Structure formats: C-alpha cells, structure tokens
Design an enzyme around this catalytic site. Structure first.
Site, short mmCIF file in Angstrom:
data_model
loop_
_atom_site.label_atom_id
_atom_site.label_comp_id
_atom_site.label_asym_id
_atom_site.label_seq_id
_atom_site.Cartn_x
_atom_site.Cartn_y
_atom_site.Cartn_z
N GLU A 185 0.81 -1.21 0.00
CA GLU A 185 0.00 0.00 0.00
C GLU A 185 0.85 1.26 0.00
O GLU A 185 1.92 1.32 0.61
CB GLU A 185 -0.93 0.02 1.19
CG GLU A 185 -0.30 -0.32 2.51
CD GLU A 185 -1.23 -0.15 3.69
OE1 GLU A 185 -2.14 -0.98 3.85
OE2 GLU A 185 -1.03 0.80 4.47
N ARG A 229 -2.92 12.14 6.56
CA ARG A 229 -2.65 11.24 5.42
C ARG A 229 -3.90 10.89 4.60
O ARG A 229 -3.82 10.25 3.54
CB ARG A 229 -1.99 9.95 5.93
CG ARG A 229 -1.61 8.94 4.84
CD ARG A 229 -0.42 8.07 5.17
NE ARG A 229 -0.64 6.66 4.89
CZ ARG A 229 -1.17 5.78 5.72
NH1 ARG A 229 -1.57 6.15 6.94
NH2 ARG A 229 -1.31 4.52 5.33
N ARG A 270 -5.46 5.75 -1.38
CA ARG A 270 -4.30 4.86 -1.48
C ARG A 270 -4.28 4.17 -2.83
O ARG A 270 -5.34 4.00 -3.46
CB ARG A 270 -4.34 3.75 -0.43
CG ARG A 270 -4.65 4.18 0.99
CD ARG A 270 -3.44 4.65 1.77
NE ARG A 270 -3.76 4.98 3.16
CZ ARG A 270 -4.16 6.17 3.60
NH1 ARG A 270 -4.29 7.19 2.78
NH2 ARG A 270 -4.40 6.34 4.88
N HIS A 319 -9.98 4.40 2.41
CA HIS A 319 -9.22 3.60 3.36
C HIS A 319 -9.57 2.11 3.24
O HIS A 319 -9.86 1.43 4.22
CB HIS A 319 -9.42 4.11 4.79
CG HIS A 319 -8.53 3.43 5.77
ND1 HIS A 319 -9.00 2.52 6.70
CD2 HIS A 319 -7.19 3.52 5.97
CE1 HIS A 319 -7.99 2.08 7.42
NE2 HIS A 319 -6.88 2.67 7.01
#
Length: 96
Positions: A54, A65, A69, A85
């Site tokens: 990831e 953050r 991803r 997420h």
C-alpha cells in the site's frame, strides 16, 4: 470484490504521482508507504501475504494522510485505487 476499473485520468492527479514513486521505490511522503497490505476483508483476490503493498495518494490541503491509497499487486499493471481507506477498490486503467 473489485469494483470495476477506473480510468487513471478520472482519479486525482496525485494518483499518477504515487504510481511514479512506486516505480522509483520512493522517496515516499509517508512512513506507511510500501508496507504490506493484508487484504483482511477479501476485497481483492486472495493472495500470499506480501503480494499486495500500500501507498498513499496525497490529498491536497489535507493535514493528515487522508483516505486515498494505491495498492499494488504483482501482475502487469495490477494496481488498485481506494478513495476510502480500503473499503472499496477499483482497478486502475492506465490507458484512459
């Protein structure tokens, strides 16, 4: 289950930045970049521990953050985007 296949151009431009950094193995903006993704929820096809990794897709203006991803698999062009997420993933179509 993978939720279809999204064009790279339809993703935030930061996704392309993440793909570049994956290819160069960094330098990475976040400490958790490059860690193994466990795929505990079986969203992606089951594979060995270590098949998936990831990486952050930076959210502009975010202090933290954020939720975006890219997960890499091992196969040719096998990269997945999540904007939540890891709750859902789409295959990234780098051809559109």
């Amino acid at each position: 289950d993978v939720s279809g296949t999204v064009c790279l151009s339809a993703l935030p431009p930061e996704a392309t930045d993440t793909l570049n950094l994956i290819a160069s193995d960094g330098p990475f903006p976040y400490s958790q970049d490059g860690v193994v993704f466990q795929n505990r929820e079986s969203v992606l096809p089951t594979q060995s521990y270590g098949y998936y990794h990831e990486y952050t897709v930076i959210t502009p203006g975010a202090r933290t953050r954020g939720t975006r991803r890219i997960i890499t698999g091992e196969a040719w062009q096998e990269d997945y985007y999540t904007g939540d997420h890891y709750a859902t993933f789409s295959l990234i179509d780098q051809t559109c």
